C-alpha cells in the first residue's frame, strides 16, 4: 500500500528473455500453424468465432515495439495463440496436435526461465 513497498523481482532481463523464448518458439518444427496471422478472408468461420486472433509474428512485433507492459502480458498473448487453436481445431488434427505440443513446449521454457 501507500509507502509500503513489496520486494520486487529484478525484471531488467525480461525483455531479452522473452525474446529468446519467442525465438525458440518460432524455430520449433511445429510452429508452422502459428507464424503468421490466420487469413480471415480465406478461412471460413475464423473471424466470427475467434474474438482475439493472435500469432507469433504479431507477438514479435508487439515485443519489438514496447507493447507489453510486463512478463505476464506477454505470456497471456502466447497462451492466447494456443487457446484460439484449441477452440477452432480438433485435438486429433495436425494443427490441433501442433498447438498442444507448442503449449507444452512454451510452458516448460517459461517455468525454467522465470520459476
Ligand X SMILES: Cc1ccc(O)c(CO)n1
In angstroms, rounded to a whole number, what is the distance separating the alpha carbons of residues 14 and 69? 11
Query: Does residue 25 belong to the site contacting ligand X (CB under 6 A)?
Result: no
By CB under 8 A, name the binding residues for a copy of itself.
Answer: 1-4, 11-16, 18, 63, 66-71, 73-74
Of 58, 89, 101, 113, the residue at the interface with ligand X (CB under 6 A) is 89
Residue 113 has which C-alpha cell?
Answer: 526461465
Q: How far is the CB of 86 from a copy of itself (least distance, A)?
A: 26
The partner in contact with residue 11, picked from a copy of itself, ligand X, none with C-beta cut-offs of 5 to 8 angstroms by kind, is a copy of itself
* Binding piece for ligand X, criterion CB under 6 A, among 1-9, 14-22, 82-90, 106-114: 82-90
In angstroms, rounded to a whole number, what is the distance separating the alpha carbons of residues 92 and 84? 15
Separation of CA 67 from chain center = 14
Q: How far is the CB of 75 from a copy of itself (least distance, A)?
A: 11
In angstroms, rounded to a whole number, what is the distance separating the alpha carbons of residues 109 and 111? 6
CB 11 within 8 A of CB 72: no
The partner in contact with residue 15, picked from ligand X, a copy of itself, none with C-beta cut-offs of 5 to 8 angstroms by kind, is a copy of itself
In angstroms, rounded to a whole number, what is the distance separating the alpha carbons of residues 56 and 13? 20
* Whole-number CA gyration radius for the chain: 16
**Where on the chain is the footprint of ligand X (CB under 6 A)?**
33, 38, 43, 85, 88-89, 95
Amino acid at each position: 500500500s501507500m509507502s509500503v513497498k513489496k520486494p520486487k523481482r529484478d525484471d531488467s532481463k525480461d525483455l531479452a528473455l522473452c525474446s529468446m523464448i519467442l525465438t525458440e518458439m518460432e524455430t520449433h518444427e511445429d510452429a508452422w500453424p502459428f507464424l503468421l496471422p490466420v487469413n480471415l478472408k480465406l478461412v471460413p468461420g475464423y473471424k466470427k468465432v475467434i474474438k482475439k486472433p493472435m500469432d507469433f509474428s504479431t507477438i514479435r512485433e508487439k515485443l519489438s515495439s514496447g507493447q507489453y507492459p510486463n512478463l505476464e502480458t506477454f505470456a497471456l498473448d502466447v497462451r492466447l495463440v494456443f487457446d484460439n487453436c484449441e477452440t477452432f481445431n480438433e485435438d486429433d488434427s495436425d494443427i490441433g496436435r501442433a498447438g498442444h505440443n507448442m503449449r507444452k513446449y512454451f510452458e516448460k521454457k517459461w517455468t525454467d526461465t522465470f520459476k
